[PDB]
Amino acid sequence: DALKVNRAPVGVEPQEVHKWLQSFNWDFKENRTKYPTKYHMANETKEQFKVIAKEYARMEAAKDERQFGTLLDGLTRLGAGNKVHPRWGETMKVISNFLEVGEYNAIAASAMLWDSATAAEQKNGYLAQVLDEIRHTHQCAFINHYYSKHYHDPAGHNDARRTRAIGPLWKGMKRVFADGFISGDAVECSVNLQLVGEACFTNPLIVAVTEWASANGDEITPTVFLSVETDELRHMANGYQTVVSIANDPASAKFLNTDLNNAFWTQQKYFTPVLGYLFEYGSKFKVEPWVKTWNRWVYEDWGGIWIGRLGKYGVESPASLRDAKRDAYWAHHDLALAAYAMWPLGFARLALPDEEDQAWFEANYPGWADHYGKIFNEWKKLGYEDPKSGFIPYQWLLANGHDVYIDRVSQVPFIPSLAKGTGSLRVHEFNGKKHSLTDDWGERQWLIEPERYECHNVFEQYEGRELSEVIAEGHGVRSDGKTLIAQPHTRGDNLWTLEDIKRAGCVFPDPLAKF
């Protein structure tokens, strides 16, 4: 009426709006995904954490205020930015900027799921995921922005978005959590990005690393990373909903086990050795063996709570698992050999394992001392850290037959004469071009899908060029134009310069030319 109405105070709660979200979609002929996909089953699922736009923003904004309060006010007043061990401060240059590209691709990957979903609730859900991955991009960006202002070496923190193009480690990062997501089947993104990427690997990559940062004086990374993963539980839930649709449809379920195995190997081939290396070698204080962190989060918990539970519904344990566990034990020690040997191509200052690091390595990985410890100790005796020594291990590697190859598929480096991880070198010639493959899973992918894996590797691009010329072209220097960003030690004196790199006479070869 004009005089009588119920004047009880009411609003509209988020779930009252979300109840009607499914009816926002309407049927027309062209209402279908724009992206290629093998998965054509019906996927009319419900978003687990019912979020509307306003509620999404109120929730995320509340996280930021607590986060930036801690960083901008409290930890700055404590001077926590320069209270990080150098080894770990250097590691965060790589970890943060590399994860940033993964968050960035995760935006795009989530958009495909957004495009390829049919339920209006999952479109609205995946847009929130798309927003989150933007948030995650700016969060990783903020760590390096924060380190750049308050940490004693801003170089590398301050410019990784171009200085990462110099080196070989960055290449494989462009696949593991990037091209591997966004360049393929859109509905399969629920398997590679979500069931494997988000459900499995973000836990050791984003959560477990927080304890390693705390152990090494870094309270910036936990403040930010722990807030990043609070978005991921919503992503896992949304991804699992689509996986249910695939496993319940016999036509599309015959594509699930294969895509799961390719996705798992795709991501572990790089994540396992690279993150293992950065944890154990890029820290002073260690939390636990990398292979136990992997066993806890990857093999047992994800393998059991996700893949093993789903085993009752046709989902097999990944056929590449045996090979992946072997990589979890040894591949990151293999990767360390290459990362230490090609240090001038990076954007971080590395530290050879000291006498107590070596004791730890040999205790948790028996055999490490005789195989890797001897090589590392010999590099130190040859002047690895001294800029006047004229010594860089990559040339030493070529002198002793320990040639380094780049996997045409995964971009992961491979030193077959030293590698203890899963691997064997297969060199094929096809249509006048030589290709080097390193494992049965990557080779099968290349043999069946060669037009997908045409990535130029560092040797093909740098062939015949002197090392210091490449570094200076790629802006791998500090502000004085001559001192390298990357260093083979983490002290403050005797930093290497461009002229110090030229003295070693290192020139890039064609590793496949001998074949």
């Binding site: 290629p36 297969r426 094929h428 010639e429 006048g432 080779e443 043999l447 691009q461 072209e473 074949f515």
Partner: protein, 167 residues
Amino acid sequence: AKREPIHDNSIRTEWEAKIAKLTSVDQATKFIQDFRLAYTSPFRKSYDIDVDYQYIERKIEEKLSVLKTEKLPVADLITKATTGEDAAAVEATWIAKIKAAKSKYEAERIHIEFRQLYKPPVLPVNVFLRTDAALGTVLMEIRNTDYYGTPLEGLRKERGVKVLHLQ
């Protein structure tokens, strides 16, 4: 072989001069398809400009596109390929082609070749992308059928590689 610098080298300079002689849409269309058939995809004719062909191709695209807006009528930008073909005709022609392929190796070739020939600005973007998705759907399903059935030694023969080394 010693590589020149990455982003500015005599090889890129030389092709940019070659590209600047293009003065018609038909000339640039023949030039861009000859380029793509000879330097792109695993079935390229030559790897001599491996590290440069992608940049060079971009500059070819930029020349053909400008020529199209300068010379072609507006309706032709939307509905026809620069070859003169009807854009919609090219889509149905190539969709039915790869759908009639008998193996992943016939399928992958048809899809690769479609891109070599009709990648924009030859074919209108909207028509190209939805055709590329339709071809990619068919190529993806035939490849992910019995994906692990053929052993590697057989996959090497089927692919036709020369095995130079097996550790």
